[PDB]
Design a protein around this ligand. Structure first.
Ligand SMILES: CNc1nc2c(CCc3ccc(C(F)(F)F)cc3)c3[nH]c(N)nc(=O)c3cc2[nH]1
Ligand SMILES: CNc1nc2c(CCc3ccc(C(F)(F)F)cc3)c3[nH]c(N)nc(=O)c3cc2[nH]1
Ligand SMILES: [Zn+2]
Ligand SMILES: [Zn+2]
Lengths: 356, 356
């Protein structure tokens, strides 16, 4: 029987690592992409804490048997802590040391966030943090990070108080500190003193751009414990994933494939394409020449173009299936190239072709 | 090797029949449901002549290899002749003995309709007819029907002039005459004198209601050749199908399953349900208790409700898959009950439960 949580590193190349997380409900191969659940297959999917806590509500999900039973998925599920989405989407918010109140009006605190994730039944639980807006001054970035670290300790204590959760799930802490090296170090130190099963890099993919994101990752990821998984939240494009793995990231949440699939964009080894464009109306090639997915084995760019231009649901479903398959082929190629000692060459080849 | 076209009747109960159509690309079990292609599985699908002739155009479909290659379907395809949809959907129309002009502006004639269906490559080709509006006076119904019969002869001649079509496809004639027995008889006689591979009942499902539709079928279907298939165009609900089979119909076009699937309606043996309704938010049963489809084996009403309320494409795709599967289980139960001599009892049991 698998353990509650065990991360093993099988091979390394530079700062890049490949290995496995073992949990009770399954093995997660890393580096991993984690797609939304409602979308070589994925080993773990994302639940949507913010949506579920409002419709149908976390209590109701528990009454229906938990999220695994509800969505018919018996493998690992990761949930975020909800504050990022509250701050991004809800209309009015009130912040305090207790938590965040938002509009029926609601309070989300470290304790309530952990209880919601418990009622949902997720396997990887995120601490309740504040994603500092960008740009931030040093003083505001520090105050925000300090609150998040106090909230990280409250998250730890709440998780440990619920036996079913402490014994069967895992808890990840989230590093903050905006773009400042000294604050990222203080945050890493605070999280390691509390102790978590894994460590996320928060506060990025918030408008800073790839060059700046990579600069911050360069000094931030080495601050986290080497022997635990590293999750970069909110990222991203295929080229962001490749560069983040080069900098020591093990886990990625990938909304973009499903978002792109419903809006006419397909990922290919030669870059993204907009299938609605008239240049695809007579193109008999599959979406991607090398893709092994079921769409590309059977149907042409010209037919998928026809369906999407016609407003047919089938068109968006085929695009989304392809995009998910593309991402899991990307991650498999990354894992294999690290294990074989040729990831540096893969990254160079990938970029030359994706951007050609 | 299968023939171009061969209809055999294997069993009969009252006016109901069950059997097979053999064509070069496959066998069609009757009574048959024929779903849209762009949606025990279906044996034949519908192409959309009106849409395809405008986007990308019939010539372009031929340049891409024909509709079978284009949509990745190597089995039989039926196409309508296009005039019904022109008259229903296009903004301005001009009618004459030559054909119909409509808005770039276009002319559709018997000869052009047959050529378009040839370029698309369909296996069952419909004659170019006029679907008389309802209600119609006897004089207007007669004039319209007479034009359609002149157009049926022109359709026959155009089809026979194209060797690839005459040797590999089949041509169906369409009966008109509104709700009038004497005109339905004249139309049947004209079509049989020309000679077709199959015979459709046109001019119904245009606002007359089920009672009147069944009354017209009662005297119209016996006028058609018994030894050829009978296609009721534009029908319909499950209860319409059962009653039409009781009256001698062999073939049905079924848009409703895909339309309902995208608009929140699921078919069940206990009648249709509106999955968005709040009464399904905690319902752990599958869409239908007896359905063998993949959706009903895996997911609950509560989860499909959640997805559709959230605007997720997955929700409509699951509803549509279920609805298609429901229709092909309906047709299989009809075929089996006729072959076993218990179709009368099936129809009674079906109605008692569907309308309970
Ligand atoms: C887009 N940029 C970004 N997203 C970020 C997220 C959200 C992660 C998430 C939440 C929900 C889903 C769901 F679709 F499945 F619902 C998917 C992904 C962050 N989350 C937390 N907790 N701290 C952060 O500092 C942080 C930074 C983030 N930058
Ligand atoms: C809805 N009522 C109705 N539909 C009727 C139709 C259209 C059949 C059709 C066409 C295209 C498709 C597509 F979705 F696949 F594109 C699906 C079905 C008729 N067609 C002709 N030729 N004569 C008629 O007298 C007639 C009567 C009809 N009553
Ligand atoms: Zn593909
Ligand atoms: Zn079903």
């Amino acid at each position: 029987d698998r353990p509650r949580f065990s991360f093993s590193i099988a091979a390394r190349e530079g700062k890049a690592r490949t290995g496995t997380i073992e949990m009770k409900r399954g093995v997660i191969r890393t580096p991993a992409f984690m797609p939304v659940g409602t979308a070589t297959g994925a080993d773990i999917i994302l639940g949507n804490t913010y949506h579920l806590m409002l419709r149908p509500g976390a209590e109701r999900i528990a009454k229906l048997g938990g999220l695994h039973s509800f969505m018919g998925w018996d493998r690992p599920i990761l949930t975020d802590s909800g504050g990022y989405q509250v701050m991004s989407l809800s209309s009015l918010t009130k912040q305090s040391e207790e938590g965040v109140t938002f509009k029926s009006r609601h309070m989300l605190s470290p304790e309530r966030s952990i209880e919601i994730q418990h009622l949902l039944g997720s396997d990887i639980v995120m601490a309740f943090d504040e994603c500092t807006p960008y740009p931030a001054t040093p003083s505001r970035a520090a105050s925000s990070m300090e609150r998040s670290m106090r909230w990280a300790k409250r998250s730890r204590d709440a998780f440990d108080s619920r036996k079913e959760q402490a014994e069967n799930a895992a808890l990840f802490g989230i590093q903050q500190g905006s773009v400042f090296e000294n604050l990222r170090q203080q945050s890493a130190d605070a999280l390691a003193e509390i102790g978590f099963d894994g460590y996320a890099v928060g506060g990025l993919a918030v408008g800073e751009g790839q060059d700046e994101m990579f600069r911050v990752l360069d000094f931030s990821v080495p601050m986290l414990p080497d022997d635990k998984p590293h999750y970069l939240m909110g990222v991203g494009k295929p080229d962001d994933i490749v560069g983040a793995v080069e900098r020591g990231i093990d886990m990625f949440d990938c909304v973009l494939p499903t978002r792109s699939g419903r809006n006419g964009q397909a990922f290919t080894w030669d870059g993204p394409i907009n299938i609605r464009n008239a240049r695809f109306s007579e193109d008999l090639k599959p979406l991607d020449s090398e893709c092994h997915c079921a769409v590309c084995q059977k149907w042409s760019r010209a037919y998928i173009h026809h369906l999407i231009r016609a407003g047919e649901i089938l068109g968006a479903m085929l695009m989304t299936e392809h995009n998910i398959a593309f991402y899991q082929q990307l991650m498999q190629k990354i894992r294999d190239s690290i294990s074989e000692g040729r990831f540096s060459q893969f990254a160079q080849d990938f970029r030359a072709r994706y951007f050609a």
